């Protein structure tokens, strides 16, 4: 609920380059500046003779908002012989996937084709580049001697990638073994130490890889998507991967052990061709330190009040439990054909309430297919089924839909304000947007009405002026505030009180405030973080019995407190926001004595 949508950071790339198809954060391992990594897989490069080789850009944060390409590889196609290229980098879609662990940056070209040494072929084995510091090495685990559809010739390695917490690379290629798909995991230490540019198929030791299986599993697309998380409690991150065509298009999600690639758990979709497994994510959403699985099925069709199927998408949320089971719940989209669930981005603890949160993208929702991103906050029971915020894209295109939200990445506090921030990509408009998280003010309010029971015959107060003999009672509203992170010490609240609120317009109001002789009383206040309960009292009174013949319904004292947000800003320009989960209104009710 606390993301700043009024003035987000906006980055642009070359038109038609799909700038924003992939997004990530960059955290150089020197506590240095932070950057944004943005993939532009159709961008033209200076590589000799290469058309739309693609590139990955590093973007400054708020220093200039400038992006510059990262030089992973400045060369063209190697030659097996004169006029006989060894590889084909044009339209290789370099940057279709980008992942960054501390210094390391991993970017891949899932449509890189390579000839072979035996015969003139064009096989999309895919390739990746890993840059640590000055060191940059090529990582093409599927560029083996296992040539063809039957082998890994069409593996498209790098289609999806991730880093484990122990500096292992998780990579997926959906084309291996007649599109059964494949997962491969290699130690970054191996990837760099064993690199030899003279060797096209590098023998990495300690490599983990799924194996070819029976033909019944063909065309399953294992490795279409990947995520990492521990699911046997041994501290070793395990491999989650979507398999969207498995189970005769019901879709599946495989989990393999991150130590030996042994199969651990399986998920299966519920509807044909829902693309169950298009996206997967792993993050502990309920604070039990057990990673929870999120699975997207952006084509899942719901049933409507009229009984009509409507394609809205669906996300499954599977809470891991110590017993090894999973506690699953579904989450349906809101707009037809919006493809809710195409992207699922762990956000860390966005509102810093103690539970991790998550963003789910409907890249083709909103007005004119401008895309929508939903924010879901976590809690002890699981994920809050109602989104606490809705992010909309402001940009429209004319060739391919903006796809705002097609890619996302959160869980990084780029402005060091104490709250994680979110990157949203929109490759259809060659745009990438950074949303910064505003600090959250938890507010403790209180309202006391004494005496509670009121006797009209009782009269121990006097009205303003010479008027006398009115029944009265006291009201004492209180307010207290605190917060986490970069916040000012002083806060200017606006409180309002209303007596006999429940009576609708055109109905007599029995209670009035003493001074104002009106049922409403406004008030500006000022409180500091962690400060004491700042209170204030005033007196209210009842009208004469002759003016109202309703002595049955109770009299509610309503209190509403609002905060002028602009005054409590920060050097960032980032205003705080009131905790949306604590209601900003409280009410106590008094009663009329009867005899």
């Amino acid at each position, epitope marked *: 609920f606390n993301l700043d949508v009024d003035s987000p950071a906006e980055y642009s790339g070359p038109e038609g380059s799909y700038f924003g198809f992939a997004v990530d954060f960059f955290v150089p391992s020197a506590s240095s500046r932070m950057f944004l990594l943005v993939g532009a897989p159709k961008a033209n490069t200076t590589q000799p003779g290469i058309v739309e080789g693609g590139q990955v850009l590093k973007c400054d944060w708020s220093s200039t908002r400038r992006c510059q390409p990262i030089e992973f590889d400045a060369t063209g196609n190697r030659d097996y*012989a004169k006029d006989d290229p060894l590889e084909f980098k044009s339209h290789q879609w370099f940057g279709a996937s980008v992942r960054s662990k501390q210094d390391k940056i991993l970017a891949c070209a899932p449509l890189y084709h390579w000839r072979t*040494e035996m015969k003139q072929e064009r096989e999309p084995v895919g390739t990746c580049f890993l840059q640590d510091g000055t060191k940059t090495v090529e990582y093409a685990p599927c560029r*083996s*001697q*296992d040539i063809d559809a*039957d*082998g*890994q010739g069409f593996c498209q390695g790098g289609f999806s990638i991730d880093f484990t917490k122990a500096d292992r690379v998780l990579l997926g290629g959906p084309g291996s073994f007649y599109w059964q798909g494949q997962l491969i995991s290699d130690q970054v230490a191996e990837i760099v130490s*064993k690199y*030899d540019p*003279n*060797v*096209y*198929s590098i*023998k*990495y*030791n300690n*490599q983990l*890889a799924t*194996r*070819t299986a029976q033909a019944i599993f063909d065309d399953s697309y294992l490795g279409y998507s990947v995520a990492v998380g521990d699911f046997n409690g041994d501290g070793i991150d395990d491999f989650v991967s979507g398999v969207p065509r498995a189970a005769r298009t019901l879709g599946m999600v495989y989990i393999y052990d991150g130590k030996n690639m042994s199969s651990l758990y399986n998920f299966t979709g519920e509807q044909m061709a829902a693309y169950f497994g298009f996206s997967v994510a792993a993050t502990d959403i309920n604070g039990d330190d057990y990673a929870d699985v999120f699975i997207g099925a952006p084509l899942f069709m719901d049933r409507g009040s009229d009984g009509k199927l409507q394609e809205v998408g669906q996300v499954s949320v599977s809470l891991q439990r110590a017993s090894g089971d999973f506690q699953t719940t579904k989450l349906n989209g809101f707009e037809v054909f919006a493809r809710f669930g195409s992207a699922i981005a762990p956000l860390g603890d966005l509102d810093q309430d103690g539970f991790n949160d998550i963003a789910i993208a409907a890249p083709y929702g909103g007005e004119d297919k401008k895309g929508i991103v939903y924010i879901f906050n976590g809690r002890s029971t699981g994920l809050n089924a109602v989104p606490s915020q809705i992010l909309e894209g402001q940009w429209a295109a004319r060739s391919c839909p903006p796809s705002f939200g097609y890619s996302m990445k959160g869980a990084t506090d780029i402005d060091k304000n104490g709250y994680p921030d979110l990157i949203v990509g929109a490759f259809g408009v060659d745009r990438a947007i950074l949303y910064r998280a505003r600090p959250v003010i938890t507010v403790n309010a209180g309202l006391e009405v004494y005496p509670s029971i009121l006797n009209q015959d009782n009269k121990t107060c006097s009205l303003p002026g010479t008027a006398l003999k009115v029944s009265c009672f006291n009201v004492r509203f209180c307010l207290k505030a605190d917060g986490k992170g970069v916040l000012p010490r002083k806060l200017n609240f606006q409180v309002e009180l209303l007596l006999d609120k429940l009576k609708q317009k055109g109905a007599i109001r029995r209670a009035l405030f003493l001074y104002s002789r009106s049922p409403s009383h406004s008030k500006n206040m000022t409180i500091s973080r962690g400060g004491l309960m700042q209170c204030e009292e005033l007196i209210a009174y009842l009208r004469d019995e002759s003016e109202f013949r309703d002595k049955l319904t109770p009299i509610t004292i309503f209190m509403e407190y609002r905060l002028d947000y602009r005054t409590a800003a920060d050097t960032t320009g980032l205003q705080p926001i009131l905790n949306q989960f604590t209601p900003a209104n409280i009410s106590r009710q008094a009663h009329i004595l009867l005899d």
Partner: antibody, heavy 118, light 108 residues
Framework: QVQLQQSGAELAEPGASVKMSCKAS????????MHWVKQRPGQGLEWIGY????????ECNEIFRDKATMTADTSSSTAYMQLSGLTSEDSAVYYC???????????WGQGTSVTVSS | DIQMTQTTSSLSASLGDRVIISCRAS??????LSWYQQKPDGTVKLLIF???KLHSGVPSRFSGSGSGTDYSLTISNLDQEDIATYFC?????????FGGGTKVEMRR
């Protein structure tokens, strides 16, 4: 840390057959071809053929087309070669060598000696 | 088939000497020539591939050169563990063929 461990010495009578193994470790066995080489006592090296372990496809030197048959067990990362219709000319040391690429063989087993006598 | 011939079947050298082994092919093999070391116990190691590329782990002393049909291995600063037989092998076309082998013996 790539290692190719070959089986022990084989003895066989004329006309019989032998089957030798070559277990690989230190790399992904399925992703690289396995070559086989013959070396007669005091002689040079003779290339028999190669096998694609994951697919079973093989290519042989025309000499050994009817002599040798190559197989592979992926689950155990083991390559096998069987020599049939044995003679005295088949008595030799037989190496297995992983395929580096670039028309070279980067890692070699210790060799399996085969002796054919009555 | 490509015929690989190592003219000198044996040569003698002393410690520290520079040893150059020759190898000729019957056809242009487009630099796809490798060099192997075989020690008296049967152990075989790859030294050079693609005519000049050191395999991982072999010392810098070994180096390769050549093109077309003529190729040569070079051992600078010969070590005691270098006494062995050295084979060349073309990899440009099947079947892979080896040279007769050159044997390096210590001088005395």
């Amino acid at each position: 840390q790539v290692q190719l461990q070959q089986s022990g010495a084989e003895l066989a009578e004329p006309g019989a057959s032998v089957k030798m193994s070559c277990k690989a470790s230190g790399y992904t066995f399925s992703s690289f071809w396995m070559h086989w080489v013959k070396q007669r006592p005091g002689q040079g090296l003779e290339w028999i053929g190669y096998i694609n372990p994951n697919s079973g496809y093989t290519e042989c030197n025309e000499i050994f087309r009817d002599k040798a048959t190559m197989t592979a067990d992926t689950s155990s990362s083991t390559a096998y070669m069987q020599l049939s219709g044995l003679t005295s000319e088949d008595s030799a040391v037989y190496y297995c060598a992983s395929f580096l690429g670039r028309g070279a063989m980067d890692y070699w087993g210790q060799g399996t000696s085969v002796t054919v006598s009555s | 088939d490509i015929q690989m011939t190592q003219t000198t079947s044996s040569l003698s050298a002393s410690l520290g000497d520079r040893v150059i082994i020759s190898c000729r092919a019957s056809q242009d093999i487009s630099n796809y020539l490798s060099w192997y070391q075989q020690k008296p116990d049967g152990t075989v190691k790859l030294l050079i591939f693609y005519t000049s590329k050191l395999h991982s782990g072999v010392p810098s002393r070994f180096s390769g050169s050549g093109s077309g049909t003529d190729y040569s291995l070079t051992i600078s600063n010969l070590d005691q563990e270098d006494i062995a037989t050295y084979f060349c092998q073309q990899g440009n076309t099947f079947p892979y063929t080896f040279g007769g082998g050159t044997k390096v013996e210590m001088r005395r």
